[PDB]
């Protein structure tokens, strides 16, 4: 069972530097390349360059040269990727993927043969500052919800009627706007015979800013 296990998600200010690890287990670490690939939330894959776990010989794409530094500790069989001068668009998921094997017969790095990958480490670079969300009502069997808008950082928790119900409740994964601020929405489905006869309230918590806010939904 060859497998690569990386570190778990970091949020960095823009202008900083991040270091991601990649623990390879199941094979001779010093016999296969390790290439690092990234992808933006919604976009495609992008090659960041390879490393030779033996000689530490590295090569990167000509748009990463200067910012990226790829090292390795062979004792513990792990590879490191350091991205410096973090920019907004450097927010992505960073993967480590093994490559072709090392031998004398042929091959430089070249071979895009990434059989085994890692669970990906998502770095998030943003105009980082802690802010409590702004909660808006979402009024209308019918559905009604709450728009938790503009907060930082992850996460926030949304309940309804202080936990009196969990039926039809569906809290959506947040989205990361281009302003480095998060936002999500929580919707619930209810009978159209309960309007004006039952109070529906969303209770949101954003502990990092600590902002508990109850908001009510009426037609």
């Amino acid at each position: 069972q060859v497998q690569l296990v990386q570190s778990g998600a970091e949020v960095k200010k823009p202008g900083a530097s991040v270091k991601v690890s990649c623990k390879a287990s199941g094979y001779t670490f010093t016999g296969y390349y390790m290439h690092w690939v990234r992808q933006a939330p919604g976009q495609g894959l992008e090659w960041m360059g390879w490393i030779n776990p033996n000689s530490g010989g590295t090569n990167y794409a000509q748009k990463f040269q200067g910012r990226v530094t790829m090292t390795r500790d062979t004792s513990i069989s792990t590879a490191y990727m350091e991205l410096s001068r973090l920019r907004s668009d450097d927010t992505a998921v960073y993967y480590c993927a093994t490559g072709g094997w090392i031998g004398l017969y042929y091959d430089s790095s070249g071979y895009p043969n990434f059989d085994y990958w890692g669970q990906g480490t998502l770095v998030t670079v943003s105009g980082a500052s802690t802010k409590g969300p702004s909660v808006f009502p979402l009024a209308p069997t019918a559905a009604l919800g709450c728009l938790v808008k503009d907060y930082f950082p992850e996460p926030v928790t949304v309940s309804w009627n202080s936990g009196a119900l969990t039926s039809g409740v569906h809290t959506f994964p947040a989205v990361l706007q281009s302003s480095g601020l998060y936002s999500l929405s929580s919707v619930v489905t209810v009978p159209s015979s309960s309007l004006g006869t039952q109070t529906y309230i969303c209770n949101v918590n954003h502990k990092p800013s600590n902002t508990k806010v109850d908001k009510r939904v009426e037609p």
Binding site: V37, L45, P137, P173, S185
Partner: protein
């Protein structure tokens, strides 16, 4: 970089095609083109390596070929589990590697989405800001396309759509947030969220009234 179609759309049973067209400084030079498959929120999976070679586990209904500067991945035995994103990758000399633009496979046929569209709240407009909320849920597989409309025009002005997330029923959900000023809300007659899942399109619409 390498260019592959924005979308491919097949239907259960068999045959299909994805093209990774490149330059002569690649593809029509090396037998070094790999094809990867990516499901929502998961790491890509090597389906094809070195043009025409299958790893271990990869079914014989996946295959590849090349003609000059054109690479070709074909799935012959189409299946709802095959619905994912597909990336072309290849070695373009000088010790560098390039990726494809991303081809999004879709299987016409069988879990339809549950769209629910919310208009800008009465309050948010008084906060001098406006937001449209398209909530999508209970669709399988986890590939959907979201397109916004202002009356009858493709907006695309800050749409922010989420990658589908696995639910408690092994189905997926997504969300699309259209951000705009209230001025461009009282102006236009209507706004619509178009959710395209597997040929079938569900469309919701709202208006200032």
């Amino acid at each position: 970089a390498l260019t592959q179609p924005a979308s491919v759309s097949g239907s259960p049973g068999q045959s299909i095609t994805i093209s990774c067209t490149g330059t002569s400084s690649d593809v029509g030079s090396y037998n070094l083109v790999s094809w990867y498959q990516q499901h929502p929120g998961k790491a890509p999976k090597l389906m094809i390596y070195e043009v025409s070679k299958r790893p271990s586990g990869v079914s014989n209904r996946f295959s590849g070929s090349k003609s000059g500067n054109t690479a070709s991945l074909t799935i012959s035995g189409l299946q709802a589990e095959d619905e994912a994103d597909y990336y072309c990758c290849s070695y373009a000399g000088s010790s560098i590697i390039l990726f494809g633009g991303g081809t999004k496979l879709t299987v016409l046929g069988q879990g339809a989405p549950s769209v629910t569209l919310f208009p800008p709240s009465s309050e948010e407009l008084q906060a001098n800001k406006a937001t449209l909320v398209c909530l999508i849920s209970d669709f399988y597989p986890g590939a959907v396309t979201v397109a916004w409309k202002a009356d009858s025009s493709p907006v695309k002005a800050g749409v922010e759509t989420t990658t589908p997330s696995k639910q408690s029923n092994n189905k997926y959900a997504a969300s699309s947030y259209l951000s705009l000023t209230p001025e461009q809300w009282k102006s236009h007659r209507s706004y619509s969220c178009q959710v395209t899942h597997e040929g079938s399109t569900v469309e919701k619409t709202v208006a200032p009234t």
